Assembly symmetry: D2
Homo-oligomer: 315 residues x 4
């Protein structure tokens, strides 16, 4: 363990939080009203060690949608229940060459990885096949509750309704994937898109999400309940992909300068994982040109520079 005195570490988090707060750049997403609503000044950071120790600063109890932050989570679910081999017969394992979410498959006609939209949609089509969307959703919700140690996990129907009503881009991807035979046989494509929009609309708080991150950072065991939620294989796979495909077009830079598994979302969230150390959720609505929370990105750089948490930092 690299945190001898938690109380002192906490004091540092507050300093970094305070410093990041001064970064007011960026634009709050506004393609749908449910996202445009948010104030650019909301800024929260919650920590949950593999130990179970907690600490929050800022707006850590204001609910917000996971959006893309849910991608690694549902992927982890798929691998947990189906295994690496099966899941990857449908999706790739690496960074798409060019632009993130450019819409095209790889050599084998599979979405490049679970973190791009086309890949997440395919992953969504693998979860609990056979049952209706109602049960599929309950199943995943239950799974997220376990990851969060039963802390806040809500749902935003307005985000859901708005996402579906204006999701022409996802429907295009939906039909494209169906024509390329990317879905398991007999898949109700439109039904999967519906399930996908719902998953993007699940709400969390920095506090509950930090626990989910902590579960990933703790070999798949929820730090505040001690129960096994995800298989070791699922966690390792998820972390590998968050390392290289979790920050959209900034993934390459992030891995190089921060070197930590992470996943951003258009709501301004950044699910951050420090292997065997802790889980975190940084949240601030204003996004940079690449879709990542401006304050969150600033905070992540500072965190690694201060505490030497970089994957390849020697210790």
């Amino acid at each position: 363990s690299m945190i001898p005195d938690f109380m002192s570490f906490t004091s540092h988090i507050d300093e970094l939080y305070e410093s990041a707060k001064k970064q007011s750049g960026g634009k709050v997403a506004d393609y749908i009203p449910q996202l445009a609503k948010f104030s650019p000044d909301l800024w929260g950071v919650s920590v949950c060690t593999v130990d179970g120790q907690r600490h929050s600063t800022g707006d850590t109890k204001v609910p917000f949608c996971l959006q893309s932050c849910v991608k690694p989570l549902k992927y982890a679910i798929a691998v947990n229940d189906l295994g690496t081999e099966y899941v990857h017969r449908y999706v790739g394992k690496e960074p798409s060459g060019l632009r993130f979410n450019k819409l095209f498959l790889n050599e084998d006609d599979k979405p490049h990885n679970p973190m791009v939209n086309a890949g997440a949609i395919v992953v969504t089509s693998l979860i609990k096949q056979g049952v209706n969307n109602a049960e599929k959703f309950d199943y995943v919700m239950q799974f997220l509750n376990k990851m969060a140690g039963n802390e806040y996990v809500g749902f935003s129907n307005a985000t859901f309704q708005s996402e579906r009503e204006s999701g022409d881009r996802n429907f295009a991807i939906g039909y494209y994937l169906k024509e390329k035979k990317c879905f398991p046989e007999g898949t109700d494509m439109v039904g999967i898109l519906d399930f996908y929009f719902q998953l993007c609309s699940i709400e969390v708080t920095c506090e509950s999400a930090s626990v989910m991150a902590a579960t990933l950072a703790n070999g798949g065991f929820c730090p505040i309940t001690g129960e096994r939620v995800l298989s070791p294989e699922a966690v390792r796979n998820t972390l590998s992909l968050m390392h290289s495909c979790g920050m959209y077009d900034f993934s390459g830079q992030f891995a190089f300068h921060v070197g930590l598994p992470a996943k951003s979302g258009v709501a301004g969230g950044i699910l951050l994982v420090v292997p065997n150390v802790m889980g975190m959720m940084c949240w601030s609505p204003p996004l940079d040109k690449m879709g990542n929370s401006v304050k969150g990105i600033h905070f992540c750089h500072d965190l690694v520079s201060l505490c030497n948490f970089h994957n390849y930092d020697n210790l």
Copy 2:
């Protein structure tokens, strides 16, 4: 440390080595005679712990050219002497989108990363600027001797002469980079290509190379001499890039399944690094379709499955 009993670990290495030996697929490179010469049955594996403990099995004393295995090493040199910021004004920090070595620059007209040929050529143009090629070469040689703890570091003039005589592809890249203004002002492009061919022709043995790898795995300190060879910054940067761009078009798969910083070469070498644990050099001339040593790749998968060395394996 994850190696309680070295002697027992050694016994496992031999088993994995023995298993990999049965893999006879692949083709020995033959674009130049100096590479076609080699027997497909040569197979060696040398280990050098951060501790300084050694172990070899197979053809670990037969000299062979580093080829691309030198890319991370000269990059480490550049960062060590010039710093991250300066070096990266000329080269990128992430996986090139499409085909490896496709020849094109990124958004900012810089080679995508130090591991592709265009990038290595640019990196080469940054080392000890101002002096002639003779001194530049001595300088790097001295540096490699330190990385190897003064073990075998030779030079193959025939590989050098053959590489230069048939390097039309590199000359095309040379002129392309010059026209795009990728070199520091006043650079003798043709002279740099010459220096580059020479660096690709430096010879090592599994034994000496494993020490170089161990130096990278030991925060930049050579395990058998204890002296500081590379700055912490240089090591971290090098390892980050070996993680995502060290195995040509197999880099993505390698990071996902093996999760260790590595760098292959057309001579059949694979410089493997296990952070804070050990350094290794696997060598077998027969290469797969992607340019990686068939036995080496097999061995790397088995090593991680057995000893749980994967970056994100939970422990």
Copy 3:
């Protein structure tokens, strides 16, 4: 005029027809049953001079769907009613760079040209805006009757029903274009796709289609009725685009070796135009790897070699 003695020209057409008949290669399209039905031995060639002189050989009265052969026709309609400037605010004027129908827009986010599917779909959304699909269809049908001098113009409901039922690729393009704002404001995208499938299902015979081609070859005047059907501007634009984008991925080769405006279709039809000379329709179900009628392509090469009809043949 380059046809002094029509009767003798006719004799040559029969010889070329007879020669092409020996070409049995290719595969009849089978993505839908309505296309797979057809016999590979059907082969017809009908000529209609700007003069009004006719000549058929082979299966020239067997109805078949225009499919892509309708693209230049509906484009001609759009330009005729809206003008060059308006139509091209929505679609490009040149060969898409890479693969034909690769699905992507050009610099200005417009389908590259009216001959690729994305472009034809957009063109379809411009015709008689404001009225329902029933009237839109009647309107175009009436227009085609005029182009054909009231000869055979039918409709295949089964092709229509099958095209719509399995058109996942077109729906993907539909949503993609809608998200990119490629349609005039207020467009019912799904409704346009429906209209598009219907247009692809319109049936003709070699005989009636040759008249349509003759109308294009006659400055927009139907050779057998003498009435003006299309504006000079519409005809010129249509011919320019048929010259460079009418034969899918073979367009470049076709322009170079044949040098005549043409448009192929998956039913095996090839609408061929010889400016100020005649119009033709060659039809044979078996298609080559690029989607063009094998016999038709053979026939077109022979026709130009014999009668020196190539755009740039000196005379």
Copy 4:
């Protein structure tokens, strides 16, 4: 013939010339001093009918380099002496997909067409193989004299010396093509580049160049000497390619709106051909963003709108 009264046509040319003169936009090329030298106000237009009738207006006797305008001419030479089949074993027959001169080969590893630099370089390697550059150059010069009916055909050694001294982009292409085995066996690549730079440095005047264009417009017969200079096959091939690849990235637009075979050059020249009618050379140093003479382009549009010379204009 579409020019009943030449004298009246002449009067129109002057009007169009006068109108184009008002277009002062664009930038004179300045990558080398020999091009930057030129005044932006130089503007000349020379006509030479298939009849042999002449007419000039403006700066039609000021020498300037053909530059890319020579590409179709040396291609015509290659086909004339080697035939279509042989020449095209080395170069393609159609518009390169993306950016003009992007540097990449097509499916068969051949430069896309004779009009892009990579293709012109390959074509250059086919002319009079076996003899030294001195004879190769004399041979082509003699050939151009015949095309020009012995009118002005000079050579700019300074352009040549400057082109070679700063041609890093062409050397990159040179080595790239050599590595891809695009040259006939035993080709001295560097020697070919030298010959290529020389060809780009050949000087003409609007007057002499218009005759060259007239020769192409006259089935390969020089209008003012009556002798056969190029084979019918050579002329047709050249014109087909000038139609689709002669105006860089504006080729598509040009074919659609102007519909005439043409070839621009960085010196500001535009070799224009009106089949069976006349040949022209428009020249004005200021170029637009796509590398085409601003006045020349304006003039070409006006010429077609006024005299209905468009390939597919009905008459």
